[PDB]
């Protein structure tokens, strides 16, 4: 009964790991979408600080396009 | 539940009550961008695409309101 006081904290900080990795996935995810509004012919800005924010994804970071920007060219490299 | 044609006749109000680096005018600011490099690159290729779709779009809501796209952008007006 101290074993499970451990996991009641354990799960704790692994839930807030899966929470600051959800977000930047969130955050790639809404940048796609953004990026494929404005191919298909919609005039909606596609820069970081225009993107949408709801808790989900919090704040855009400039390393957050780099990061897409390196993964759309790895995805449509391997093709 | 509005006629197609009213929801211009406020989205253009958003877009001319809307200070200079708002997100109203900075999503508009791209059709812009897109009708000024189109029309540059047709100054310099020498053809103009088949598929000018931001060069058309300004100039619909050019027609729809022209004291804006005037005022705002002073150079697709012209």
């Known amino acids: 009964e101290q074993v499970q006081n451990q996991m009641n904290a354990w799960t704790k900080a692994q839930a807030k790991a899966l929470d600051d990795s959800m977000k930047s996935m969130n955050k790639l995810d809404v940048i796609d979408k953004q990026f494929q509004k404005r191919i298909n012919g919609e005039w909606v800005s596609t820069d970081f600080k225009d993107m949408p924010v709801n808790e989900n994804t919090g704040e855009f970071k400039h390393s957050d396009m780099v990061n897409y920007a390196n993964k759309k060219l790895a995805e449509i490299d391997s093709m | ?78």
Do not use: H
């Not at chain 2, 197609?4 to 708002?22: E, I, P, R, T, W």
């Not at chain 2, 029309?39 to 088949?50: D, F, H, R, T, Y």
């Not at chain 2, 931001?54 to 952008?73: F, G, H, S």
């Open chain 2, 1 to 78: 539940d509005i006629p197609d044609g009213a929801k211009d006749a406020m989205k253009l109000k958003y877009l001319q009550a809307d200070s200079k680096d708002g997100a109203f005018r900075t999503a508009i600011g791209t059709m812009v961008t897109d009708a000024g490099q189109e029309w540059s690159a047709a100054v310099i290729n020498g053809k103009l695409p088949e598929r000018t779709p931001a060069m058309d779009a300004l100039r619909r809501i050019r027609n729809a309101d022209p004291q804006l796209i005037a005022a705002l952008y002073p150079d697709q007006a012209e």
